[PDB]
Design a binder for this molecule. Structure first.
Ligand SMILES: Nc1ncnc2c1ncn2[C@@H]1O[C@@H]2COP(=O)(O)O[C@@H]3[C@H](F)[C@@H](COP(=O)(O)O[C@H]2[C@H]1F)C[C@H]3n1cnc2c(=O)[nH]cnc21
Ligand SMILES: Nc1ncnc2c1ncn2[C@@H]1O[C@@H]2COP(=O)(O)O[C@@H]3[C@H](F)[C@@H](COP(=O)(O)O[C@H]2[C@H]1F)C[C@H]3n1cnc2c(=O)[nH]cnc21
Lengths: 193, 193
């Protein structure tokens, strides 16, 4: 089983594709509660995930992934094993002491990037979204009221909103009108570069 | 608290919008395990949902909703209560003996329909999808290989795939190329008209 890091040129369009990884196998990583890195065991966090993406050859690969808590500093490519000793992933993304476990995970977004853009945001708890912006509900409501009369044009930009209680994806046309929204009912964080 | 059925002309763009319902309140229906209809109690099904949508004024309102199991025949608009006696929803969609509980639910899709289409499919367990079609994995892989060289155009059609283990939404351009995919990691059924 082989795992190649996108950050080091490892994308291969004929292999399984996950955020940060091209692999010869497709592991369902939702099932693990404990993993091992350099013979140290780490617990998977319950009920909170990490929204991770890689962008390679004009292809966006994004998903909500399990994460484990680790006070050691780990680096891209470090092999991640199950407790039986099999390698199941590699280190890819981190948020402080949380490390993503990349593989088949929770909700996902795959997208052809040619002709569009995509942006990621931390969603403040209690805020509302319209289109490309977040703000207080009453501010957003006023914005939505103004944009209601516009005729919807083609999607040109994607906005990913990652919150403690909900995640969502919005899309806009060139005039800023919201065209489509999807909501994922899970809480998560974004990686910190 | 008022609940108006979209099937009977009840859409109101200034009220909370859920599949089949415009309401003066926004109830989180994920929390209920038991509901009441005409003073009979019904259990909510665990770990399996119903993908429901209404299409009103060129607006698509779709979501994965809890469902309860009921051997009585119920009709659109029948009031659904919590066990404290408060009305929390109305009957909207059914799949045999399953009835959707519409409100704030699980994963959702909101979409402006002007200029695009949308279609719903039962996803056969074990099948793969590309674009507007499902089939056996090796058939779909051959299709994807043919379409790989095409340049992505604007989204014109949405396809909703509802399976026992996963739900997904794909989008295509006028040439049938897949532009974007979202996956929801929950199992569900579609309503039966
Ligand atoms: N070589 C093969 N690889 C994979 N599946 C294969 C293969 N041969 C046959 N099949 C069958 O085909 C269907 C379609 O699966 P599909 O790839 O559409 O997506 C699936 C589903 F959303 C979910 C469970 O699906 P499952 O119930 O297992 O059904 C499968 C399976 F029965 C996991 C997800 N998933 C799989 N791989 C990747 C990946 O690389 N990236 C991102 N997500 C991935
Ligand atoms: N009058 C108000 N109504 C609603 N929220 C209000 C209001 N005033 C202030 N707020 C705050 O604003 C944010 C943005 O919520 P938003 O509407 O974006 O979507 C939310 C989230 F995805 C999820 C939990 O969000 P929550 O943590 O409660 O945060 C809220 C809240 F703090 C439920 C979902 N949801 C709410 N209503 C509907 C609806 O009618 N249809 C479909 N989904 C709906």
């Amino acid at each position: 089983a082989m795992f190649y890091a996108h950050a080091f040129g490892g994308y291969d369009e004929n292999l399984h594709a996950f955020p940060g990884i091209s692999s010869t196998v497709a592991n369902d990583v939702r099932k693990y509660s404990v993993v091992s890195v350099y013979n140290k065991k780490y617990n998977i966090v319950k009920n909170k995930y990490m929204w991770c993406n890689s962008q390679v050859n004009k292809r966006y690969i994004g998903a909500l992934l399990p994460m484990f808590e680790c006070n050691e500093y780990l680096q891209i490519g470090d092999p991640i094993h199950d407790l039986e000793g099999n390698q199941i992933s590699i280190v890819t993304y981190r948020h402080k002491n949380y490390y993503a476990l990349s593989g088949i995970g929770y909700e996902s977004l795959d997208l052809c990037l040619e002709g569009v853009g995509i942006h990621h945001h931390v969603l403040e708890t209690g805020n509302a979204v319209y289109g490309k912006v977040q703000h207080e509900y009453s501010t957003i409501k006023e914005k939505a009221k103004e944009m209601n009369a516009l005729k919807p044009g083609p999607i040109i930009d994607y906005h990913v909103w990652i919150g403690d209680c909900v995640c969502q994806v919005t899309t806009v046309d060139v005039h800023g009108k919201e065209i489509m929204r999807m909501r994922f009912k899970r809480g998560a964080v974004l990686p910190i570069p």
